[PDB]
Design a protein around this ligand. Structure first.
Ligand SMILES: C[S@@+](CC[C@H](N)C(=O)[O-])C[C@H]1O[C@@H](n2cnc3c(N)ncnc32)[C@H](O)[C@@H]1O
Length: 460
RNA sequence: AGGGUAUAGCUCAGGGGUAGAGCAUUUGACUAGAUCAAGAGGUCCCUGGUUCAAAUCCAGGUGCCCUCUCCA
């Protein structure tokens, strides 16, 4: 609709092209079709998901209560507008709020401000512009000025600049709460509000300090993963890559905080964020450690590392290229950087399989779209580890696996791949809201999401 | 079969031989700054290798980073 395709390096886009135009897909669909599919994907990746999805912390508040409180909250934020809050029938603890956009009639002001690409993406998802996000602003900006926020999608704006000839993307208008002086004079690492978005291109609720013990902003497939893993109360679960602990706290909440959830991460501050989240949401069965997942198997003779076959369930939410991220308007990565994940994923996978009890469940999940990080890893896993066996999932929401890794149709039907190019981009407005069938909205929330991949394994 | 990165206070270009920009800061004019000028600035992370010569190329070491909604 409003935004162009995701700005990729020629080599990278050709890499992904090689991915989606393999012999098998061409065979079962034809070049003319697969190419259009790929281009449609690239066109969709630049646009926000049509649904703000919120996970309810059932261990502190029920979905009903939280939904009502959020109804009051949306009443306040949108000055009395009328956007619905659906409840997913399959994901019992997930709420869905439709996105009102895009709005092409926003009049651009002269006082401008430029944020980082990531901050821009956050703004498109319904966030305000907080102080650490601004990397450029009009030198004549005073606190209170109605300014126009632009996203430096290329990340080429040198901080503090008074002008920018690079690539900007209009995100909308907002009331500033700081002058350019207050921001860039001296070096105060100041926090707080910077630009209160009043007329965003996409209208989504701001989830900063609202019900922090009851909510958790989480993409639909991410919330789905913990359900697919299906943790039982009293079991021993471990996710190698956990920070900041969305799926971790979700797993803990599904177990009614009765059991043991060990969460690892390589970076310290991230682990601290895990612990902070767990403490915030009221989960006590969560124990977080700063540790290398690839070296998590006990070898010497003396917390991690852990003995092999000592965990009931294991979640590998492996680090990835993150190509399935939405909205992602540009990606200035090298191809070597994009394909730099398969080995690490395989190491973490091996460490996971070794750490898994017999008849245990291993859920491997990424947020990327590449074959080499998804289906290929499933094939590799099924070959190297013959004790593992691919399992069907519940709930089944996303599409089936992509052809190309040499898996059978029966095998692909047991994978869950979310495709951004599944359904057309819905340009929702209030008139579209009023005349909308509920099943259409639910299908929309299930299909128009970020790129994601879920695979389920069982040991013998 | 993991990868990227380290350069001025901040944000970053560059590049085998005299250290570069924007912003911040400093000073001087014009009416505190939507003006004009002027200069203050860095063992280019550590170590070793290649080389006449490494801030640049290579290897090892270390720190930071590779999202999976919102203080960026
Ligand atoms: C996709 S993110 C985690 C999202 C998280 N699972 C949730 O659902 O919020 C991958 C994480 O992997 C961690 N990580 C990166 N390398 C790792 C490694 N070798 N071992 C363990 N964790 C790693 C990163 O610090 C990052 O927090």
């Amino acid at each position: 609709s409003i935004f162009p395709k995701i700005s990729l390096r020629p080599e990278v886009e050709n890499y992904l092209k090689e991915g989606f135009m393999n012999k098998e897909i061409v065979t079962a669909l034809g070049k003319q079709e697969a190419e259009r599919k790929f281009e449609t994907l690239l066109k969709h990746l630049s646009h926000p998901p049509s649904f703000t999805t919120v996970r309810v912390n059932t261990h502190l508040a029920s979905v009903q209560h939280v939904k009502n409180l959020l109804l009051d909250e949306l009443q306040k934020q949108f000055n009395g507008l009328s956007v619905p809050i659906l409840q997913h029938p399959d994901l019992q603890d997930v709420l869905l709020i439709p996105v009102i956009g895009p709005r092409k009639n926003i009049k651009k002001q002269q006082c401008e401000a430029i944020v980082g690409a990531q901050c821009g993406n956050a703004v498109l998802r319904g966030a305000h512009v907080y102080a650490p996000g601004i990397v450029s602003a009009s030198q004549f900006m005073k606190a209170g000025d109605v300014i126009s926020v632009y996203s430096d999608i290329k990340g080429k704006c040198k901080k503090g600049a008074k002008e920018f000839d690079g690539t900007k993307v209009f995100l909308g208008n907002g009331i500033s709460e700081l002058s350019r002086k207050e921001i860039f004079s001296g070096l105060p690492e100041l926090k707080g509000m910077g630009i209160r978005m009043t007329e965003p291109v996409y209208l989504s609720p701001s989830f900063d300090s609202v019900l922090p013990r009851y909510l958790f902003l989480q993409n639909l497939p991410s919330a789905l993963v913990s359900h697919v893993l299906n943790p039982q109360p009293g079991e021993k679960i471990l996710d190698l890559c956990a920070a900041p602990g969305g799926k971790t706290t979700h797993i803990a909440a599904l177990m009614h905080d009765q059991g043991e959830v060990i969460a690892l991460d390589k970076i310290f501050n991230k682990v601290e964020k895990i612990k902070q989240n767990a403490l915030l949401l009221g989960l006590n069965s969560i124990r977080a450690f700063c540790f290398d997942g690839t070296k998590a198997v006990k070898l010497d003779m003396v917390e991690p590392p852990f003995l092999p076959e000592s965990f009931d369930r294991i979640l590998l939410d492996a680090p990835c290229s993150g190509m399935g991220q939405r909205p992602n308007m540009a990606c200035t990565w090298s191809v070597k950087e994009v394909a730099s994940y398969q080995p690490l994923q395989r190491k973490l996978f091996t460490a996971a399989v070794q750490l898994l009890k017999p008849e245990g469940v291993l859920v491997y999940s990424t947020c990327t779209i590449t074959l080499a990080e998804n289906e290929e890893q499933v094939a590799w896993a099924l070959t190297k580890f013959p004790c593992l066996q691919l399992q069907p999932q519940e709930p089944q929401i996303g599409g089936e696996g992509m052809r190309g890794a040499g898996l059978s149709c029966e095998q692909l039907k047991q994978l869950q791949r979310f495709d951004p190019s599944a359904v057309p981009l819905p340009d929702t407005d209030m008139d579209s809201l009023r005349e909308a069938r509920r099943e259409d909205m639910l299908r929309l929330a299930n299909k128009d999401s970020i790129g994601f991949f879920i695979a389920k394994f069982v040991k013998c």
